[PDB]
Design a protein around this nucleic acid. Structure first.
Ligand SMILES: [K+]
Ligand SMILES: [K+]
Ligand SMILES: [K+]
Ligand SMILES: [K+]
Ligand SMILES: [K+]
Ligand SMILES: [K+]
Ligand SMILES: [K+]
Ligand SMILES: [Mg+2]
Ligand SMILES: [Mg+2]
Ligand SMILES: [Mg+2]
Ligand SMILES: [Mg+2]
Ligand SMILES: [Mg+2]
Ligand SMILES: [Mg+2]
Ligand SMILES: [Mg+2]
Ligand SMILES: [Mg+2]
Ligand SMILES: [Mg+2]
Ligand SMILES: [Mg+2]
Ligand SMILES: [Mg+2]
Ligand SMILES: [Mg+2]
Ligand SMILES: [Mg+2]
Ligand SMILES: [Mg+2]
Ligand SMILES: [Mg+2]
Ligand SMILES: [Mg+2]
Ligand SMILES: [Mg+2]
Ligand SMILES: [Mg+2]
Ligand SMILES: [Mg+2]
Ligand SMILES: [Mg+2]
Ligand SMILES: [Mg+2]
Ligand SMILES: [Mg+2]
Ligand SMILES: [Mg+2]
Ligand SMILES: [Mg+2]
Ligand SMILES: [Mg+2]
Ligand SMILES: [Mg+2]
Ligand SMILES: [Mg+2]
Ligand SMILES: [Mg+2]
Ligand SMILES: [Mg+2]
Ligand SMILES: [Mg+2]
Ligand SMILES: [Mg+2]
Ligand SMILES: [Mg+2]
Ligand SMILES: [Mg+2]
Ligand SMILES: [Mg+2]
Ligand SMILES: [Mg+2]
Ligand SMILES: [Mg+2]
Lengths: 146, 68, 50, 101
RNA sequence: GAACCGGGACGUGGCGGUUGACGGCAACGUUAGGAAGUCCGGAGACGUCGGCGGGAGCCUCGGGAAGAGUUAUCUUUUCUGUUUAACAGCCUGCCCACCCUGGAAUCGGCUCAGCCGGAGGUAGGGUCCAGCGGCUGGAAGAGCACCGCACGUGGUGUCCGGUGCGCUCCCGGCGGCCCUUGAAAAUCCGGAGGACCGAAUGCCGUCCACGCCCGGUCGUACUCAUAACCGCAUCAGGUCUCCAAGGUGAACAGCCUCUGGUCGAUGGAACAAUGUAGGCAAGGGAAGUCGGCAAAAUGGAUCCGUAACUUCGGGAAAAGGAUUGGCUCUGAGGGCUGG
RNA sequence: GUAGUAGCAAAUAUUCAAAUGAGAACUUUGAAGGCCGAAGAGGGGAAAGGUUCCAUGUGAACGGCACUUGCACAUGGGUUA
């Protein structure tokens, strides 16, 4: 007894693929009598036609490995395939630094810790690659003001 | 669909000759009065349940009132 | 294709009507020599040319 | 604060389980502060004739209680007959029911 | 069920008459708020590359609740989901542009990069523009999940956050490139002009709101291909394009997986020669052969180092050398609030 | 004649149980083991085809083995602005 029609209709009614349709192997005769979507829908309620669960694909391993990477594991030279630029462009690092340093200079000017004359001087030195991070810029400002 | 903000305005549109029906939708935090007109479905939201009952019995006779 | 002219669709309809077996009672007529439909067409074997 | 209930009526009446045993399982296996069995003042387990009650002084996951109850059923080879189901009446209660085979 | 568009017709209300509205210093705002021939502008309407910024969908992390999987041991764990359309109103106001005040060297502002300012910067306060942004209506009554009762019907939930040189698409703005400068028209909007026109207050005008009526003809199944097209065929060939998950990794490389699809290539038994495809091999190392043909060797990344020659740009990954797993740690590089 | 000979060999792969049938390595269901691995063997469309779409049934022929099978054959149904 061919059940091709019932499996096709069950897939459409269940809104799933034909591979996820389960037709009760012990009720082939009962299922074979359903030739309409109304009949299929009734069989779904009765439990003779069931949508099987999705095949398992867990992310536990991926999440577990990300924890190890967050601690610095698997990050040695033997685990690197792209160039340092490919892994993280130098332009990206430069953009981060300027936005951090320019943000820091604006807030100091707004709070009047530095005047516009000192802001301009520090602004051009930041663009000139003088200060490599937030800490050194703060120390230079304190030293210059003293 | 348009929203009516004033109960007075809702009553005026409920008396229109093209108002086919009114439906009462009672949610868990307010009551919605929906009146079907020719072009738009106007909806009025009344948070106070007690204040909604007064409007319910103030609708013009002959207008099909339904409870949802 | 799905996009087709009215004229072409009409021609295709006539070809479908002509693609049938001869009635059985034709072969029982007096002095009959028509054995079968000699102009049968299958969509995959011979193309319509239009 | 949180208080959850495990309504064990259908199996207790049919002598399918021992409500006292489930109380012991929850007390030993419940983890407070990351360590099992350290209920302390935070977590208290009180049983009745046909109902188990779990109260917590801080945030307590309801699904965590289901995880432990299901584990207890598996250890007693009764999962194929029993199943933990939430109650439509109360949102802090789990009920033990049978499969409609 | 809820909207919209193009036509047709009149009615009610509203609006204007200082005959053709009002507000704002201004940029402009408001729902209406004359007008003919003629005239003018705009939209439609446009290359390519690169960097940034914004929006949407997806991916991804945590918590809450629902079901499922695992459970001798371990696992507050693993998996599935956890929804919100056009359209209408209100709010928001990106990146730019624009307006008012004010008048700048001790020059300042400012981008990743530019760049901007007495032709008016910074600053202070505004206007406008985008939206695939927010809220509400639409709309939970739907959808989905789950639990019941019957064999249609009821109940519960659909919640609260984080993250980014991520991916796809859209948009913004800027820059590079040309002896290359990268369509047209239909259609629509706006403007200049003011011939002509009402009322002494009832007529006239009205792109406003609401109500009423109308909607031709043809195409629409299916395949779109290792079987629906062409190649004489159910031919390993040929045939334009859209959507595009997780892991590894620089990577729509290769390798493995989820959704979806599929096991369709006539089968069975033996394991000779010869063959085709894939390999390996002591010692020697091109002696083989027309010829290193074929194969082998090299290969990613980090650090060091790099000659002749040169059109000074290259040569260059020249050459040569070192390092690379796992595990447990240390240091450095940020954001938002609080005077 | 050649001759029941050349030949059926790319695209990893099938196995178990049951049902149906005169007849099952090849149809259908279930279970397992594999593959495509999102520039797909997935989901659509433009050309081109023209009913191949769907249901039921089937003597032969055809689907280069076989078939209970079907893009084959027979009957009917199906494309709404
Ligand atoms: K639309
Ligand atoms: K169609
Ligand atoms: K082909
Ligand atoms: K051999
Ligand atoms: K040689
Ligand atoms: K096509
Ligand atoms: K049309
Ligand atoms: Mg990169
Ligand atoms: Mg650079
Ligand atoms: Mg052909
Ligand atoms: Mg011809
Ligand atoms: Mg133009
Ligand atoms: Mg270039
Ligand atoms: Mg972006
Ligand atoms: Mg300003
Ligand atoms: Mg809403
Ligand atoms: Mg609902
Ligand atoms: Mg693209
Ligand atoms: Mg004018
Ligand atoms: Mg179609
Ligand atoms: Mg198909
Ligand atoms: Mg296709
Ligand atoms: Mg030909
Ligand atoms: Mg990576
Ligand atoms: Mg890849
Ligand atoms: Mg050797
Ligand atoms: Mg050797
Ligand atoms: Mg040697
Ligand atoms: Mg030699
Ligand atoms: Mg020789
Ligand atoms: Mg060679
Ligand atoms: Mg050289
Ligand atoms: Mg032979
Ligand atoms: Mg061969
Ligand atoms: Mg063989
Ligand atoms: Mg093969
Ligand atoms: Mg096979
Ligand atoms: Mg492969
Ligand atoms: Mg694979
Ligand atoms: Mg692509
Ligand atoms: Mg055959
Ligand atoms: Mg078919
Ligand atoms: Mg046929």
């Amino acid at each position: 007894v061919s059940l091709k029609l019932q499996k096709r209709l069950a897939a459409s009614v269940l809104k799933c693929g034909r591979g996820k349709v389960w037709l009760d192997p012990n009720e082939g005769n009962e299922i074979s009598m359903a030739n309409s979507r109304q009949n299929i829908r009734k069989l779904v309620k009765d439990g003779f036609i069931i949508r099987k669960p999705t095949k398992i694909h867990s992310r536990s391993r991926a999440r577990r490995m990300k924890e190890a990477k967050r601690k610095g594991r698997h990050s040695g030279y033997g685990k690197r395939k792209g160039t340092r630029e490919a892994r993280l462009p130098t332009k990206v690092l430069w953009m981060r630094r300027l936005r951090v340093l320019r943000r820091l200079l604006r807030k100091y000017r707004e709070s009047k810790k530095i005047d516009k004359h000192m802001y301009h001087d520090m602004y051009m030195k930041v663009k000139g690659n003088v200060f490599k991070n937030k800490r050194v810029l703060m120390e230079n400002i304190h030293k210059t003001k003293a | 669909p348009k929203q009516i903000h004033e109960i007075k305005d809702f009553l005026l549109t409920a008396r229109r000759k093209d108002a086919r029906t009114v439906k009462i939708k009672k949610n868990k935090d307010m009551v919605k009065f929906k009146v079907r007109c020719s072009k738009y479905l106007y909806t009025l939201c009344v948070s106070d349940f007690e204040k909604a009952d007064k409007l319910k019995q103030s609708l013009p006779p002959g207008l099909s009132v339904q409870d949802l | 294709p799905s996009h087709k002219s009215f004229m072409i669709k009409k021609k295709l309809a006539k070809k479908q009507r002509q693609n049938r077996p001869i009635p059985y009672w034709i072969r029982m007529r007096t002095d009959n020599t028509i054995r079968y439909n000699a102009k049968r067409r299958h969509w995959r074997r011979t193309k319509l040319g239009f | 604060g949180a208080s959850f209930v495990i309504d064990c009526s259908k199996p207790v009446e049919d002598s399918i389980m021992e409500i006292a045993s489930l109380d012991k399982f929850l007390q030993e296996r419940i983890k407070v502060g990351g360590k099992a069995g350290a209920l302390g003042d935070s977590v208290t387990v009180t049983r009745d004739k046909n109902k188990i009650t779990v109260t917590c002084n801080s945030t307590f996951s309801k699904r965590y209680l289901k995880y432990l109850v299901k584990k207890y059923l598996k250890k007693n080879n009764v999962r194929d007959w029993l199943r933990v189901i939430a109650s439509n009446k109360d949102r802090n209660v789990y009920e033990l029911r049978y499969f409609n085979i």
